[model samples]
Target chain A: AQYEDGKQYTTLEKPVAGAPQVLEFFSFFCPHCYQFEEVLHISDNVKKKLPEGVKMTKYHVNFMGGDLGKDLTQAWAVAMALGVEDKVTVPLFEGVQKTQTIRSASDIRDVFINAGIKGEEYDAAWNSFVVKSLVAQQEKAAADVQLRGVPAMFVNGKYQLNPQGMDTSNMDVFVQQYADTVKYLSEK
Target chain B: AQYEDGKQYTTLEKPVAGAPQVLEFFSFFCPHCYQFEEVLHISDNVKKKLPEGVKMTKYHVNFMGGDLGKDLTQAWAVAMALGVEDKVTVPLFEGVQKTQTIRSASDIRDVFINAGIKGEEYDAAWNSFVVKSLVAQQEKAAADVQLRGVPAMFVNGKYQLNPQGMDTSNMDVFVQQYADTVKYLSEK
Candidate 1:
């Protein structure tokens, strides 16, 4: 009974994924998402020890709704397309989590600019046709995976781990455990 | 409860540390360490997700008593001292795991040459006094850390996790769980 089967994390129906893959569906405004900075991006520990053939990816979820969520999601989509994810992901989260003022896509665009990417470059990235395609693709991928909450993890496309509503106080341990379960399933 | 704290993993009396560090202790002679290859190396999954400042390193262990263990240990120590770990580590493990016949460091030396490290270069790495010093460092590290087997992980130098002889069947989960624990512990 280590994991609650379908609650903390559930296995997805992913079969085409030949290697073990971890899909993290996140949001820019989620407080819990900010708490995961150490595990996801702040500390490189998880990044360093993943089993061979296993990959971890992040997709921004627009759970906030209205203009703000859509805006930040667009910026993140562009950031990923421009290869500035590593540069912009943490700072944007930091801006929101530390100050709680990240309410618009424009604010997030400032984060991209603050990371030293010039405005034109940011515009080019944000407005690129490629960025639009990827953003659409990410949105569909998010739905295809049945993404329902922040800090959600899908293991090999079959398991879903939702930390937001987990009945445990130590969600961190479960968050970490879900990765292992996915690795095991990936090997099988 | 997703995990049984003391059984699946344990925490050391670690003091405050800035960033998480994972030190994997392995031996070439140990067959299990080869099975752990994907988890330890091969992909950039864990490395890419690691927080800034967190680092992971591997150390060769010689717990298996014999000439083969001693010889392989010496080569690994020299390899580390000579900066040949990235070249020789995985290949050496593969040779042993795939063939189970790499009984001598001499056979292992050829792996270095195969990776374009010249025989003379191998000789330098093998025979350097710095190699001796590093070998001693590894040995003392092995003892001070009280390591008893291959595939052990120590986070921030205090937390120790041994993954053999556990009562459960899902050792992969534990192995992966231990890595996350180290990440969390390192942050602490």
Candidate 2:
């Protein structure tokens, strides 16, 4: 759990209170985020290494894809609320960055439908109170972070991983350090 | 040896003859090449997985870092000619890209001296016929690649690995695919 602040991470001015948590900031329209999730699988790999009682969450960024950014963020909220993120997240990324297919909220609904969410269930969740609240919360979190880019991660809402400062001499080293940093901060 | 041309790799119009060889074009000044060698260890990792009878060679691009690029390339030639590359490559990369301590050939000479090479030995190799020829050959190969960017790789001097086309969902997958592509081309 040995780690250095400012090199591996930067501390939050006001530390968030709760059990250990990991929050990832990403967007479907960001190519780097697409690579981070679809190619690098950073989140999935880190998820496997996170300690018990540590909850990892994602905040869809409401920026980068024009007005569609807001729509996609809301759509992500619905996907997460429905617990169908695992099935549709990659497709959503692929549709935007790889395949150039998804362009609107309607397009996202198709992805959810294709993932086996009934059309009625998707409609019901799209504008539900929980979904709306989740979207607003994510947007506020995104704004609070004032992120320079997507595919960023924070642990316990108190430390943000500084990728440029990490040792990336190889993938194994990078992934291990990344996961270790997250674990360290989560436990701290 | 199963690989698809134009997808996994692109074939050269005139294939090079001789033993199966893996030629990498890199530069000490290039951050990606530094990362490729230092962080990702792609070259070393792939070397371990290469098929027998296959040889891998590195060519430092002489088109970057101003006139220092040519000097550094020549310096690398000297390092390889003296068989001290294993001792000095990373330090050179760090000096140029990380530490910014190497601003001239004199700085490169210091790296070799610190690596335990005698000053006389370094001078002898620096202007030796073999070092001169290696630098020229590398320069020609770099120009021939017509590369938009590096740390690029070529196998058998007949096929170029298309990194953009590979499955990179994880580090393991990316490394395996990279090594496999090199092995396939080497054996072909």
Candidate 3:
């Protein structure tokens, strides 16, 4: 679908996958999203505990992406293109989560270089249409999800998990319950 | 436990009723509390959904009580003595929540009279020891809770709910869930 420059992009009209899917909608500037990162990183283990065939995808929503959206989008796109998504993705997540200072695209690029991607390759990928498209995809997903805030998760394209909406105090348990819900839905 | 005069009252720990109790820690100068009157009034229905025996109590924390503390304490005392907790409570909540124009004890008394409390009762309650004691109780509760702002609640004496801690969009749901949590805990 074509995206207008000023308006939010819409989510994919149909489910991205026929099997149950979990989409984590997040933004870099959100503190709650930063907190959820610790638990979400461990979600692979949580997934292992889940009933099979459930897939989880992280979509970075740039609703507040500011001027850095294009740059950050390119960075993520380049990483995905290089097939080293884990390398760039892990550090990008960490930089935002751990740093006491305001995060910037330059900081993200520094993380990319430290993660073993060549500076030249990183620069090229950072500007690629592939990265731009991925960022657009997230914007669309957030619009489609009808999201109000960060760290939201969509389960099976039907349920939305907002830790803040449930209980802000016990996020781990809430997320675990959501994962369990996904498992239950998958079994059906 | 006995509460001694001038030394502060520690004996008025929130009652242990198994059911959740709500403590409205408010200041007479708070604008949010004034605006919250209608919403709080509607909360009676929310309270009905609570498990039997759960109760909500209003404790007027006096930010304006000053060094005397007596005047503020007496204000609350008179409300209790008159058995018009809801009546006085709503006006006090609104007076502070809606207007910056009313700031002093005399102003508060005028609002009370305007809201239908007899002028003599208002005068008497404004000077009564019950109001004085209630003010003292609020001061002690604020110190104990390490409160940062007004319009806060202590649920069943276990959870402290602050309006600022909530996401603005989900506040109603948050209040509902808080009431539910109180009910759940009361049953236990």
Candidate 4:
């Protein structure tokens, strides 16, 4: 079973395979996204305990227009290019929550540089084709996925995950449920 | 200290001596006036316990223009002329509360007639100088007193009583407080 074309997955150069994928579509400005971050980090911990070939990836959906979308895309692109996506995720979220500042391209690049990516490499990667493609993919995937609001997660392109829907306030429990869903989907 | 002539206390009808005058200013359609009926009725009961020389009298305030005001004013005039002013207060309040019917002059006049005022007397009283003067007094007093809302009360031209200002939920407590205030002011 597959989602309708232009409704399911965005075209990614690195097709997800060999592992059951946990894809989260989210926005930086969304308060729900902030709440979901705790769950995502907890899930990351839970994910490590899972069998090999099961992986979690965040697809930064930049529907929040203006400087917000630009900043988040830039940040995500830089993080992806530097291979330091995990290190910057929580920090970027904390920064947004604390300052309520929209991460612009320059702001994202600065965060990458501050997080140990070299200044020249950060600048070069910021304008690189791969980062540019990923950024474009996120924008297209947001529209193609038929996303409404963040922070929604999907398991193996089969089951939608909503942390609020389950009524579990604890992030650990919420992530555990998500892992269970992913495990169940992979077996089926 | 006297209130400004033609500004405050506009109507100069002879004050009924030894009668503790309770001037109730109310509108026929106001929901608060209807909701306040029980408290007003309790206040009427407390009037019996009042020190002699206090009387409760009602003046229907007419601010909403057109036939509605005319009807209410005429009803007040007829009640005063027939000398049945003492008996019709609560019943008039009830009629306005229970029915969504237009409380026009004719409807109020019918209420006066039903309360046993003779038909001829009711008709003649409608046009009497006392009725005209009292209606004019009500209009002037409402403006001069700077009255905003209905069900306002004044005791012996000294203290203004607003039953709505009471905090307690129990209607009887509110009435008792009003009676106590009137008693306290009258003694001074």
Candidate 5:
């Protein structure tokens, strides 16, 4: 299926485990990514509503090598591994965007405690081998795609949606449209 | 020009000092109103974008008489009177919606202090004659319009935009559209 003019997407050389994968590539501190997430307020909720054959995933684009960027990427990996991304993502964004609250690994830990994550669980995930491996894996994946800026959208492995001044009245619908576009491609 | 289907508005019988008087009647705790503001993230930014002749104002609808509603309405009144509504409005919504950091009048007072308002200024505004009288006036004004539910939007003073389910992809555009519509009305 054809896509919107500015809503361009790339085709992956290899298909994902799922026929059509709806993936988002974003950096935690990137201003555009932050605005997209804040404006849509989806992230956790949209994944819950996907069609059966489609899968949703997000890659934390790292490798810029800024101290804050790397730290936030690790924080995201930790929260994702600990099953607490839903709890931490918004606050982390709020902290960076408005509050200047979360700055270091220690600051991220405080956010976990504030959100009621058990201490032992947070400690285990904070720098676990699994979390470290996932962060490493994302660096490789982003390199493969030649990732530039975020918040970018990809369908299956190939289609890349441009994120310039792109916007929509309804994010849910915008997402569904992309999903539908991918579903049509998969069927073809 | 006729307004958008859900974008109904009423003109106030009394002409406001500023033409194209765009007023909103809302209760801070009113779930409907809270969701509307959350979606828009306005309550401050919109006024900055208005064209030369447009003026924006919000009236705290205080008829419900619930403890939480009255407390929030008072908080809004105090913030507006002290000219700190920009700092207080969004945080107050966030506190009620997710933070759960504020509840009673004393809790609301802390919100002021946290926003950097000095205690003396807070005291002066909290129970000032102007704040109390403005809140009281809203009660009579609400009755005049036969206001039912909250988060209602008004153009001029009489025409009201219904709050039933009108939403937008972008609030800035939604507001600009209304402002443009009202500008047209005033010229008519």
Candidate 6:
């Protein structure tokens, strides 16, 4: 790879073990993150472009909404636990970001219920040990990375890719460049 | 001259009499609005490209931050009244939108003060009759339009420009297209 260190990516002090994984730190409350996930589908786009043996991971950060941030993080955990991420991600993003409709836990429940999860199922998963563990792990990971703001990407948990340094003149150019960076770092 | 109605723009029910004027409703807290104003400099770009007699106007909207929205709107009014909008607009936008530093009226005052306005001047302007009048008029205008969100533009207070309808693949294209639409509407 011909990418510059500390420019395209900075080497993490304590490099993570996974050599071909992209870990994303993001929040539903962030406008840029919402656009990256929803409008541009950067995650999905990058997934398709990743090389063999390289994988992508996402951790919903709990810092944007204050106390509600934790609740939203739990909601994300519950969605993952139920294998309903696809069904709920957009609705949650739309409610939290676009429409400003998801202000409380009940509002979050409504989205899950509408996504075909029974209220009881939602309640169980929301408070279940698995969901709690997921939330804890996500918070730990976010803390470990010293995450400031979101929609940040780290390849193999060692190299932090710089979207700000990339040309974002257009969506196509941005998507291609981001995928290329991730792919290049993963192979390193 | 050949733009389609409701696609490029929707006509106001009670069309305003002012010809060749662009009124923008925006908020310091909005991400897209921040990008439009700061990163892309859309407002400035449009102004230079518009036809003669076509002028741009801005009204800071008060619908994003709940109670704080009014404070932000008042801050905008004070800036306009003091004739120091250029000095404070980006700082205010950066504080409110980018860094999330402007959380209250006092924080807003600090921005104006840093821009070289004395604290006493900011205080006076904040409570002055002129600023109050400006805030009231802005609120009234926003209500008349039934504004649902920030960063909306109306040409001649009649044709509402549809940014979503325009191609935003790149900033250059988007800016050019936006300026052309405004120029076209102004002539009409």
At residue A29, candidate 4 shows an lDDT of: 50
Tens digits of per-residue lDDT for model 3, B1-188: 22122221122244434423656566555534443444323256446776666677666654544632345456666777777767766566444432222456686677668768889878876667776666666667677666666666566665554333232233345456545544554343
Evaluated at residue B85, the lDDT of candidate 3 is 67
Per residue, candidate 5 scores C-alpha lDDT tens digits across B1-188 of: 35654444445466444323677787654544555566544544445545577677787875432345676777778887888887887788776545655545676788899999988888888779998887777666666667786666666664665422223345566655555554555444
lDDT of each: 0.63, 0.78, 0.55, 0.60, 0.63, 0.80
DockQ of 1: 0.01
User: For candidate 1, lDDT tens digit of each residue in B1-188?
Assistant: 13344664566553324322767777765544555564444113335545688777777766552445677778887777768677776787666644433535567778878888889877987888987887777777777666776667776776665443232235445444545555555565
**Lowest summed lDDT window (length 10), candidate 5 chain A:** A163-172
Worst 10 residues of 1 chain A by lDDT: A164-173
Of 1 and 3, the candidate ranking higher by TM-score: 1
DockQ of 5: 0.02
* Per-residue lDDT value at A46 in model 3: 47
- Candidate that would win on TM-score: 6
- For model 1, how does the per-residue alpha-carbon lDDT over A107-156 read when each residue is reduced to its tens digit? 78788788999999998888888888878877877778666777666666
lDDT of 2 by residue, B1-188 (tens): 45788987898887665523898888776655665676568888889889777788988886655566788889989988888889998999888755657766788899999989999999999979998899888877866767656678988778888876787556567777888888877777
**Number of the top lDDT candidate:** 6
Model 3: CA > 4 A from native:
A1-20, A39-42, A100-103, A162-175, B1-188
Task: State how far residue A120 of model 2 sits from its true place (Å).
Answer: 1.5
**Best of the two (1, 4) by lDDT:** 1
Question: What docking grade does candidate 4 earn?
Answer: incorrect
Interface RMSD for all numbered candidates: 20.8, 13.2, 16.3, 25.3, 14.0, 13.8
Where in model 4 is the C-alpha error above 4 Å? A1-20, A101-103, A169-172, B1-188
RMSD, each candidate, Å?
18.0, 13.2, 21.4, 24.4, 17.4, 17.6
Give lDDT tens digits, candidate 6, residues B61-102.
877654566888898999999999899988987776556566
lDDT, residue B47, candidate 4: 72
DockQ of each: 0.01, 0.03, 0.02, 0.01, 0.02, 0.03
